Amino acid sequence: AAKDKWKLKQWYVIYAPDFFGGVEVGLTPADDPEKVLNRVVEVTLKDITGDFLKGHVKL
RNA sequence: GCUCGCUGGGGAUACUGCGGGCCUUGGGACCGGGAGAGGCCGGGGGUACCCCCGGGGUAGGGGUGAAAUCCUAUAAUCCCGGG
Ligand SMILES: [Mg+2]
């Protein structure tokens, strides 16, 4: 019955804000699309633009 | 010699006292560029902790040398968004 509830979830793709390039940053599961609002994701500046100097900046 | 105590006169001016004059070293006043968790009043913040509401998840959490009381199917511990 529990695994039945897990099958109801779909995956959504998360994009960076517009002025950072709007690139893909990850995926998240949810059954109702309204529940995805106000979720927060943390990424490093190196992932956005590749350079091993700014790996300690978190957005 | 003792009753070391009193009293009439004369002399001296180093020290203490008293009166006058003149100083700046002790102390105080003022000006300059700086130092400091010294005090009082107003404003703005930092993490942390406790309670409440909403979403996920399901059987333990907590605590001791070892345990038990205690919290938890009215959904806890743990994770996320708010007050
Ligand atoms: Mg809940």
Curated annotation (Swiss-Prot):
Gene Ontology terms for molecular function: structural constituent of ribosome
Domain of life: Archaea
Cysteines engaged in disulfide bonds, as pairs: none
Keywords, sorted A to Z: Ribonucleoprotein, Ribosomal protein
The keyword Ribonucleoprotein is annotated on this UniProt entry: yes
Tagged with keyword Cytoplasm: no
GO biological process: translation
Name of the featured protein: Small ribosomal subunit protein eS1
Organism per entry: Pyrococcus abyssi (strain GE5 / Orsay)
Segment of the intact protein contained: 9 to 67 of 199
